[PDB]
Write an enzyme that holds these catalytic residues in place. Structure first.
Site, PDB file in Angstrom:
ATOM      1  N   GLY A  72      76.567  34.534  21.474  1.00 25.33           N
ATOM      2  CA  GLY A  72      77.630  35.251  20.750  1.00 25.33           C
ATOM      3  C   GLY A  72      78.766  35.724  21.645  1.00 25.33           C
ATOM      4  O   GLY A  72      78.763  35.431  22.849  1.00 25.33           O
ATOM      5  N   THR A  73      79.738  36.405  21.035  1.00 27.91           N
ATOM      6  CA  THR A  73      80.879  37.107  21.684  1.00 27.91           C
ATOM      7  C   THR A  73      80.353  38.394  22.334  1.00 27.91           C
ATOM      8  O   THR A  73      79.254  38.841  21.951  1.00 27.91           O
ATOM      9  CB  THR A  73      81.995  37.356  20.661  1.00 27.91           C
ATOM     10  OG1 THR A  73      83.017  36.387  20.877  1.00 27.91           O
ATOM     11  CG2 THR A  73      82.611  38.730  20.755  1.00 27.91           C
TER      12      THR A  73
END
Ligand SMILES: [Cl-]
Ligand SMILES: [Mg+2]
Lengths: 244, 111, 241, 243, 244, 233, 224, 242, 250
Positions: E30-31
């Site tokens: 993910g970010t």
């Protein structure tokens, strides 16, 4: 999800057989033999107790012969626990019939109902079949003395003489060789024991390894008696027919 | 005990010409002997060139008009922008009303 | 609770559960129906794996649905009972609401619709059964005979057989049944039914049961002697050559 | 034929591998706990490990206040621990409401054990990967330790220990109860029962403890409560003026 | 054998749940998002990757508000994070309906914690594919939390998850050491912009868009609000200065 | 590897992927291209419709949800009917209950949460369709992109389906030009036709092949097909 | 089916050139007992809407929570919650009108008459009524209970039709509302001297006035 | 095993693609739309000569202005016709008008994807897709004479002409050349009878093939065998003519 | 969520074996020895307390359980499975009998209701059979004293005497030697203690042995007086002391 662990108990084989019904019938083939013989004046139920001990209380013991009514009875072959579930629903079906109609249930109607319950387990619900084969011995005023058989498929049929469990091939040949239609109950008692005495995988055939029941009328009554034999009585008849 | 119905008065009037129609109604909403409003519209353009009034109990009338306008919107969506013929609108409203046969909308409706 | 999809499509476009249900029918005892000019006859063979049976009480192969319609079958006996009950209940329900017995086509369409449903419902396997359904519509004299199979397909037959060795007895009827001239009598229609079974049954006095159905709810089952007479006469036809 | 290791059904050896593997989860946290009984108190010591500097020390605990009287120390992962805690609290509140008295320690234990036994027999539920140690001063039985595991087992303990180094602590305590001939720490104040617990945890593990290395819970007649860092530092100061 | 990683509720022979471990891979993929606990509040920041010039600036908001006082940011499967905040919102509303007071952050933390843990108890669901960073101001001060796909949560001084988590944790650790008395809400906002810029070198190929929110007792009255206009620009400049 | 962890949507792969969802995403790319783009005053949908034979009709790609909102599809149409149905009822509920036109942003959030429910429960299957949602609300023109993963994005422009990368790159280049076509619906549609024709290869867009929809300041969502799109080929 | 227990009397309201005024007294009656005296029956929602509630106060308090829940919910994933996508009077009204009609239709009403007064985002005056039956109407003047019988007649001598609204100033309207509140204290047996008043102006915003009192009363003529 | 609503790595549902295979194994069905009406033709395909052919019902009436032909597992069609009929009659009860052909088709197709083991959407209880494709021919005021192909995938196409079942790819290629927008109804009839003749293993007569049409005036009529007989005679004469 | 395990986990194999019932009986074999002996005027049931730690208090774990005031149960196998079977056995004795006939069920009928519960675990969706075999000992007015065995299958059998668990084959042989139909309850306890000694490795005293009888009525264990018809429970758990006294005459 769950899919992974489902045996799928209600499918067809490529040959169009029901796996679980076939394997249940396999189970039942190892079970103590049970024999039903219908005569002109009554019915006989005999069954071989599978596994015993000097210490097993035989007076309080019942693993094969069960009363469904005052006119109906069953010999069991297979899982006892499974049989007792089916026996209890059948005892209730008979009492519902009696309450609705104020007549005792016809034998075929009781048999069909049990057989339809077993069929259910074959076609939906995804549960294992009942590992049980029944011989039904009843009397009603339409067809008189009747003898039926039912197995895990939900299939039932009617007989003059039949066996379920161990050594049915051997037992059925012997019955078919010495059974006549004008037989008396006392003769059917003798035939039933001889057949068991010849198919037994055990050394001899003693009283402590047998369940025995009869359904005889009376000329001095006109009503039907269910006599589940007590151990001493099985010992007495065992001498009278010449097996000591 | 709680009475689910009331009466907001008003009157409506529908006349059919050869190539036109009118649906009229006073703009007065009342309760018992009090005036609630001197300008409360009661006759509505529902689209597809159909006008509608449901006079009597305002709360039951505004409900029915709402459900019918919505019935027009969902007819367009379900039947490829087809026009709702007046005869068809009528039958649709018969079903809206009869839907509440045993707790009716206390309105007399004209389209 | 249990809704697992047991009847599904395989890659070649088959439904193996339906296909295998037919294999249960193929294993089942033979059943045959031939329709006369003014009657229909249903024949069924009886097994001989065990024989010490009570023929008074043993459930017979031909079942009455109403006083004017019969059903025989080939496949799982226990599965047959569930179809027969549902149909008998649909028969009494039809009379109650329409005030008229079912047509033979209607009763058939209902049985075929049930058989089909068991092929696309979660948690169930198909019926291991095919049915012949034979009778006379109310106040009609023109005989009807229909067949259903586990898939849920049905159709009407001049004559048809289902179950073990049905291939053989079909081949017989295909080259012994004239659509131009249907068996004009009850007697000669029964004879064409027995002749057809005798190809498969192999000497069966007690191994053949026949039911004759006539117009206006006139249904009767032949006895061992009535059928034995037919066997006798058909064997003399052969030997006189 | 290999799926008897994925759900709670019997292997051919009569074993439930999913239960056996659930017990393996209990040690994942690498935390040791011990409970002892006083004359009129019950004490639970648990190791407190805080590896990350970004953690809020105050929010890192495997001891739960179930009810005014019952306390629970968990050996196992915190998510299953907190699942067990919430259920035990819910059960504790419902018992009081339905039967008009505070749920006893041993009865709560039985109830959580019956719940664990169900995951042992129903296939759709996994067992919880935790061992629940319950402590109170029961108004009938007195000071009480009752412990449950993923198998659905439970029993009462004179004292008990849980975690990777369970056995070291157990045999230490075992030797003390052969010597003293009794079945509780003969001490009037809980303060000197907490000192007894910490002392025997140091001698069994062979490790020293600061005030942030430990987590302490005490049950008295009519209250269970935890000690602050500052209540423990007082406790560490007293054992130090003796060795 | 094996197959310990195909079914969610299943324990490996070493006491692990592989399906939860694999959800963690979705999160790490993910970010990068962070939380910073200041002396009267909490700050949330998140990296938004610009795929193309076609994404409308400022318009695809990732940080979500629960009740009026709680902020949530997450890394991993975004729709999973949304599903959890909808549960968060139902849970906070339920609590306020009965007890009148808005839900304390610890109370709210366990409410999320128990839900996510519920999603590791059954093979008929999948674990959450997010690590959630959430908190705000209640009766007795500020609270920062992080919640893993296992259900595990703790309080934090600082927290980070996703792509840039090692860069962030390193930078958070320095702040905790260099400010023992506490960080202010104004400072924490600037410091949060910096930590997202420095942690964007693990993703440096694609351009990005900074998003910050805060809940400070003094600066926003203990309510969750977004950082916008001048205070957002001041914070962007503070990071753009210190990245060189 | 992949074969073991793609049986159902409830299973994570060892790299943290959901294969049933990534297969659903593939149903979009195999689908016929469509394009959305907007200015401050209007939002457009241009779609290339796909026929089976030369005897068959071209399958409709644009669905109207309300007077101020509608979408183009790429992938399974029967899933696009389910989601556009659901969205019609959310637009409907907003009006009857709050006498309020549903915000295009909020339409996105509601689709996302419906998509997500299919990708965490056993027995379900992900949606197999992508949608470009356009609307005019209280904050002007909007264009959304919906993936069955659950991911919804707000963009000035985009394209989905087969060879959709051509139109997407063109838009990415034209951005400064078309964002400023305010109060000229004709010139925005021409800009969107030019975009879609960057994804052609097979054929050249014809009268019974091209579908266009528009919404704006004083333009209710309306669909142009056949002869009506002649003046734009 | 219920019966109201603790009750609030008249809510009165009218429009003027640039917005709306609403007022209501601070009393919760318990039959003939004047039981509670601090009760606020004007609910502000955002800074462009007031909701005035008469009838059962248990039901009023429930409707007060429904409106705080609506404010919270509208801010969720809404970056324009304090601008273009803030709650409008008409959004709040239609929500209450829906709930009221649903409850009467389940034979379990909220035993209330409600007046929503606000300014819409476009500068327009909003004033609309709904009650326990789900009946709804607008007018330049609206009142509940006694206010219907005595306040409307007085307020209609200032704004009789729509054409009068742009001729009416805040001062003129406000005085009319203050006098109507006095007249109601004179003649309503379930009314209080103490009342709250709210102005929503499309320029000056929302002005909420607490702890007002009926002044300049004529009792002097009684001695004869 | 593997789920019933699973996607292939190509982005196709397994159970729908396998279904499409079942429909290729079915009897042939041909539809031809014209400005004078729509024609529906089917291979009866009796499995024996003892089968009473006219009991083979592969063309059924839905309403007076709508009929349909089937190819595939025809037992699977029974519940789809019962739903169409109910839809058309129900539409007429609510709006005092005939249902559009396109809306009726949309309604049949809405069933097709209602299969699963409990799929997170509504309550799709039905173990597998339908194993049958439908041709749906009709007239309405709005769009005139229409032919639709209704698949188990839940999509429907509008065709000027279409063939489905065993002879399909062959027959469609034949319809491609033959069809023009100014075909008469009589031309359409012969053209169906011809293409059936080509793709049927059997020799075509009035007992192993059936014709039908739908015209605005008389509505949907199945042609009895005597009328189809005289169109077979007429076909043979025109083909011998060159 | 929702139990999606609606299908049997116990199915027939091609041999006609029920794997899970066979495997459950294996689990019973691994469990500690327990036994039961019927006398003319009572019944005795016996087992070893196999303490899992000397820090545990073996008094806070009962392997012998009162089901009704005239019926008692013991087991071999998985203790948690026995615990919840005892809960369900006590409760069915009330719901299915006492709340209808106002008396306690006779032994054979309560045994039947336990068997039924265990049979269901063998066939119901999504469960494994119980990993226990019970010995249930009881008195009723019309049948007298009885002893039953109940297996994971749900099959039950009446016994003059028997043993289950670890050393059961040996123990059954030792009971077949010693038993007769003329045993007094004291002689049966004596034989039970001898038989259980062949099974116990370590300490054999009243702290490591759990033993109970169905005997005479104990009016001192009833908790009230006045009603003559009530004479009090026939089930009595022997004390640590009462065992040790009979071990000095062993
Ligand atoms: Cl419990
Ligand atoms: Mg389990």
């Amino acid at each position: 999800g769950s899919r992974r662990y489902d045996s799928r108990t209600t499918i067809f084989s490529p040959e169009g057989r029901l796996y679980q019904v076939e394997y249940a019938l396999e189970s039942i083939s190892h079970a103590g033999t049970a024999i039903g013989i219908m005569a002109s004046d009554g019915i006989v139920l005999a069954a071989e107790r599978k596994v015993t001990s000097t210490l097993l209380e035989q007076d309080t013991s019942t693993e094969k012969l069960y009363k469904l009514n005052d006119k109906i009875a069953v010999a069991v072959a297979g899982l006892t626990a499974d049989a007792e579930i089916l026996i209890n629903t059948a005892r209730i079906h008979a009492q519902n019939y009696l309450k609705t109609y104020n007549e005792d249930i016809p034998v075929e109607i009781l048999v069909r109902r049990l057989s339809d319950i077993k069929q259910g387990y074959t076609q939906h619900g995804g549960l294992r079949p009942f590992g049980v084969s029944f011989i039904y011995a009843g009397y009603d005023d339409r067809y008189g003395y009747q003898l039926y058989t039912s197995n895990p498929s939900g299939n039932y049929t009617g007989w003059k003489a039949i066996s379920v469990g161990a050594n049915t091939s051997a037992a059925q040949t012997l019955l078919q060789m010495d059974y006549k239609d004008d037989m008396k109950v006392d003769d059917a008692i003798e035939l039933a024991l001889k057949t068991l005495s010849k198919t037994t995988d055990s050394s001899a055939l003693t009283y402590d390894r047998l369940e025995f029941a009869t359904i005889r009328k009376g000329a001095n009554d006109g009503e039907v008696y269910q006599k589940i034999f007590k151990p001493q009585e099985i010992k007495d008849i065992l001498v009278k027919t010449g097996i000591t | 005990q709680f009475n689910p119905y009331g009466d907001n008065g008003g009157t409506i009037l529908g006349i059919a010409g050869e190539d036109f129609a009118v649906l009229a109604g006073d703009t007065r909403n009342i309760t018992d002997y009090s005036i609630n409003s001197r300008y409360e519209p009661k006759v509505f353009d529902c689209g597809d060139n159909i006008v509608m009034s449901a006079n009597g109990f305002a709360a039951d009338g505004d409900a029915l008009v709402k459900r019918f306008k919505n019935s027009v919107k969902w007819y367009h969506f379900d039947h490829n922008d087809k026009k709702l013929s007046i005869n068809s609108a009528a039958r649709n409203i018969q079903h809206l009303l009869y839907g509440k046969r045993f707790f009716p909308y206390y309105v007399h409706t004209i389209i | 609770g249990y809704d697992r999809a047991l009847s599904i499509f395989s890659p070649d476009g088959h439904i193996f559960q339906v296909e295998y249900a037919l294999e249960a029918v193929k294993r089942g005892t033979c059943a045959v129906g031939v329709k006369g000019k003014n009657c229909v006859v249903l024949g069924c063979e009886r097994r001989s794996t065990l024989k010490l049976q009570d023929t008074r009480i043993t459930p017979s192969k031909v079942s009455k649905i109403d006083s004017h319609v019969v059903l025989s079958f080939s496949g799982l006996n226990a599965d047959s009972r569930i179809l027969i009950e549902k149909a008998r209940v649909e028969a009494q329900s039809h009379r109650l609401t329409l005030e008229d017995p079912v047509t033979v086509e209607y009763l058939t369409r209902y049985v075929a619709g049930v058989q089909q449903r068991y092929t696309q419902s979660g948690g169930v396997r198909p019926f291991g059964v095919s049915t012949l359904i034979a009778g006379f519509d109310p106040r009609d004299d023109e005989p009807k005979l229909y067949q259903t199979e586990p898939s849920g397909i049905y159709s009407s037959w001049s004559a048809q057989t289902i179950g073990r060795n049905s291939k053989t007895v079909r081949e017989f009827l295909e080259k012994n049944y004239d659509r131009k001239e249907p068996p004009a009598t009850v007697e000669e229609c029964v004879k064409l039914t027995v002749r057809s079974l005798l190809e498969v049954v192999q000497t069966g006095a007690k191994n053949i049961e026949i039911t004759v159905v006539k117009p206006d709810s006139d249904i009767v089952a032949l006895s061992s002697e009535e059928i034995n007479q037919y066997v006798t006469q058909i064997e003399q036809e052969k030997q006189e050559q | 034929a290999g799926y008897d290791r994925h759900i709670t059904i019997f292997s051919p050896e009569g074993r439930l591998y999913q239960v056996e593997y659930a017990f393996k989860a209990t040690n994942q946290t690498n935390i040791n706990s011990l409970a002892v009984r006083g004359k009129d108190c019950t004490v639970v010591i648990s190791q407190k490990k805080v590896p990350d500097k970004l953690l809020d020390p105050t929010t890192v605990s495997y001891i739960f206040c179930i009810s005014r009287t019952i306390g629970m120390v968990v050996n196992g992962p915190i998510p299953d621990a907190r699942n067990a805690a919430l259920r035990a609290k819910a059960e504790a509140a419902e018992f009081r409401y339905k039967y008009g008295y505070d749920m006893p320690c041993d009865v709560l234990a039985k109830r959580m054990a019956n719940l664990s036994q169900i995951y042992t027999q129903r296939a759709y539920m996994r067992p919880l990967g935790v061992i629940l140690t319950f402590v109170s001063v029961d108004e009938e039985l007195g000071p009480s330790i009752y412990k449950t595991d993923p198998a659905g087992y439970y029993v009462g303990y004179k004292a008990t220990a849980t975690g990777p180094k369970q056995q070291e602590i157990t045999t230490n305590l075992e030797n003390h109860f052969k010597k003293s001939k009794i079945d509780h720490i003969n001490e009037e104040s809980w303060e000197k029962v907490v000192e007894f617990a910490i002392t025997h945890m140091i001698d069994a593990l062979g490790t020293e403890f600061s005030k942030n290395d430990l987590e302490v819970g005490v049950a008295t007649k009519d209250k269970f409560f935890t000690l602050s860092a500052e209540n423990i530092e007082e406790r560490l100061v007293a054992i130090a003026e003796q060795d | 054998g094996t197959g310990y990683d195909l079914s969610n509720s299943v324990f490996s022979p070493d006491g692990r749940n592989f399906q939860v471990e694999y959800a963690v891979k979705a999160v790490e993929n993910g970010t990068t998002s962070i939380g910073i606990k200041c002396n009267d509040g909490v700050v949330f920041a998140v990296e938004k990757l610009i795929t193309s010039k076609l994404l409308v600036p400022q318009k695809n908001v990732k940080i979500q508000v629960v009740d009026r006082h709680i902020g949530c940011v997450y890394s991993g499967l975004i729709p999973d994070g949304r599903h959890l905040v909808n549960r968060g919102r139902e849970e906070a509303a339920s609590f306020k309906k009965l007890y009148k007071t808005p839900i304390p952050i610890p109370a709210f933390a366990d409410r999320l914690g128990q839900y996510v843990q519920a999603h590791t108890l059954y093979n008929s669901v999948r674990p959450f594919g997010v690590s959630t960073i959430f908190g705000g101001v209640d009766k007795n001060g500020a609270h920062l939390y992080m919640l893993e796909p296992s259900g595990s949560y703790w309080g934090y001084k600082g927290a980070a998850t996703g792509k840039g988590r090692q860069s962030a944790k390193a930078e958070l650790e320095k702040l905790v050491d260099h400010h023992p008395e506490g960080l202010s809400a104004r400072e924490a906002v600037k410091q949060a912009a910096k930590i997202i810029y420095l942690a964007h070198e693990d993703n440096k190929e694609k351009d990005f868009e900074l998003e910050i929110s805060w809940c400070s007792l003094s600066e926003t009255n203990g309510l969750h609000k977004f950082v916008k206009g001048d205070l957002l620009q001041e914070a962007i400049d503070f990071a753009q200065k210190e990245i060189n | 590897f992949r074969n073991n962890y793609d049986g159902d949507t409830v299973t994570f792969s060892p790299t943290g992927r959901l294969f049933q969802v990534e297969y659903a995403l593939e149903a979009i790319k195999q689908g016929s291209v469509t394009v959305g783009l907007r200015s401050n005053t209007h939002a457009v949908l241009v779609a290339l419709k796909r026929n089976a034979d030369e005897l068959s009709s071209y399958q409709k790609k644009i669905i109207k949800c309300d007077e101020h909102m509608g979408l183009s599809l790429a992938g399974l149409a029967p899933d696009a009917r389910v989601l556009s149905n659901y969205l019609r009822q959310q637009c409907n509920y907003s009006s009857l209950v709050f006498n309020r036109k549903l915000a295009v942003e909020r339409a996105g959030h509601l689709l996302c949460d419906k998509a997500q429910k299919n990708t965490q429960s056993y027995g379900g299957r992900p949606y197999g369709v992508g949608l470009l949602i356009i609307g005019y609300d209280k904050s002007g023109a909007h264009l959304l992109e919906f993936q069955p993963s659950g991911n919804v994005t707000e963009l000035y422009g985009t394209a989905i389906g087969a060879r959709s990368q051509g139109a997407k790159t063109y838009l990415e280049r034209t951005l400064d030009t078309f964002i400023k076509i305010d109060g000229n619906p004709d010139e925005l549609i021409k800009a969107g036709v030019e975009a879609i024709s960057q994804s052609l290869r097979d054929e050249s867009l014809t009268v019974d092949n091209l579908s266009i929809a528009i919404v704006g300041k004083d333009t209710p969502f309306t669909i142009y097909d056949g002869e009506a799109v002649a003046k734009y080929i | 089916t219920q019966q109201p227990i603790v009750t609030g009397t008249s809510v009165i309201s009218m429009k003027y050139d640039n917005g709306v005024i609403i007022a209501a007294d601070n009393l919760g009656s318990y039959g003939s007992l004047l039981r509670f005296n601090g009760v606020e029956r004007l609910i502000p929602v955002g800074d462009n809407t007031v909701v005035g509630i008469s009838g059962d106060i248990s039901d009023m308090q429930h409707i007060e929570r429904l409106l705080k829940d609506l404010v919270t919910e509208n801010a969720y994933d809404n970056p324009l919650a304090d601008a273009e996508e803030a709650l409008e009077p008409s959004y709040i009204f239609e929500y209450l009108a829906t709930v009221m009609y649903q409850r009467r239709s389940k034979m379990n009403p909220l035993w209330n008459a409600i007046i929503v007064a606000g300014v819409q985002s476009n500068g327009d005056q909003f004033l609309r009524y709904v009650n326990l039956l789900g009946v709804t109407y607008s007018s330049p003047t609206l009142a509940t209970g006694f206010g219907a019988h005595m306040a409307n007649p007085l307020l209609r001598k200032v704004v009789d039709r729509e054409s009068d609204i742009p001729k009416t100033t805040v001062q003129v309207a406000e005085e009319a509302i203050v006098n109507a509140m006095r007249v109601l204290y004179y003649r309503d047996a379930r009314s209080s001297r103490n009342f709250s008043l709210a102005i929503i102006d499309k320029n000056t915003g929302l002005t909420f006035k607490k702890n007002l009192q009926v002044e300049n009363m004529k009792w002097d003529f009684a001695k004869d | 095993d593997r789920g019933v609503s699973t996607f292939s790595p190509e982005g196709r549902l397994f159970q729908v693609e396998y279904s499409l295979e079942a429909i290729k194994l079915g009897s042939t069905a041909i539809g031809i739309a014209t400005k004078e009406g729509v024609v529906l033709g089917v291979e009866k395909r009796a499995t024996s000569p003892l089968l009473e052919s006219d009991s083979i019902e592969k063309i059924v009436e839905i309403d007076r202005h709508i009929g349909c032909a089937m190819s595939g597992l025809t037992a699977d069609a029974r519940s789809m016709i019962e739903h169409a009929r109910t839809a058309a009659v129900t539409h007429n009860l609510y709006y005092d008008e005939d249902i559009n052909v396109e809306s009726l088709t949309q309604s049949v197709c809405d069933l097709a994807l209602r299969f699963g083991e409990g799929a997170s959407g509504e309550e799709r209880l039905m173990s597998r897709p339908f194993g049958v494709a439908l041709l749906i021919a009709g007239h309405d005021a709005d769009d005139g004479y229409q032919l639709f192909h209704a698949e188990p995938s839940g999509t429907f196409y509008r065709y000027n002409a279409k063939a489905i079942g065993s002879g399909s790819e062959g027959a469609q290629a034949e319809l491609l050349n033959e069809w023009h927008s100014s075909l008469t109804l009589k031309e359409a009839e012969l053209l169906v009878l011809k293409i059936l003749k080509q793709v049927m293993e059997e020799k075509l007569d009035e007992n192993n093939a059936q014709l039908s049409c739908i015209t605005k005036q008389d509505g949907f009529k199945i042609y009895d065998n005597e009328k189809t007989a005289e169109l077979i005679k007429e076909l043979k004469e025109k083909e011998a003519a060159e | 969520m929702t139990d999606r395990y609606s299908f049997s986990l116990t199915t027939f194999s091609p041999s006609g074996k029920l794997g899970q019932i066979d495997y459950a009986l294996t689990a019973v074999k691994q469990g500690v020895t327990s036994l039961g002996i019927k006398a003319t005027n009572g019944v005795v049931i016996a087992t070893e307390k196999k303490s899992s730690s000397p820090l545990a208090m073996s008094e806070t774990l009962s392997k012998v359980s009162l089901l009704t005031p005239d019926i008692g149960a013991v087991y071999s196998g998985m203790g948690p499975d026995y615990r919840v079977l005892v809960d369900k056995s006590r409760k069915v004795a009330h719901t299915s009998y006492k709340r209808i006939y106002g008396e306690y069920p006779p032994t054979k009928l309560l045994v039947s209701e336990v068997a039924k519960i265990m049979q269901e675990a063998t066939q119901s969706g999504g469960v494994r059979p119980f990993g226990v075999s019970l010995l249930i000992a009881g008195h009723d007015e019309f049948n007298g004293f009885s002893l039953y065995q109940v297996d994971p299958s749900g099959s039950y059998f009446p016994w003059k005497a028997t043993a289950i668990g670890k050393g059961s084959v040996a123990a059954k042989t030792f009971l077949e030697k010693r038993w007769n139909d003329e045993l007094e309850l004291e002689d049966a306890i004596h034989i039970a203690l001898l038989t259980l000694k062949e099974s116990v490795e370590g300490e054999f005293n009243g702290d490591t042995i759990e033993l109970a009888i169905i005997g005479d009525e104990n009016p001192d264990l009833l908790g009230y007086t006045g009603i003559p018809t009530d004479k009090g429970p026939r089930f009595r758990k022997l004390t640590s002391q009462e065992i040790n006294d009979r071990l000095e005459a062993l």
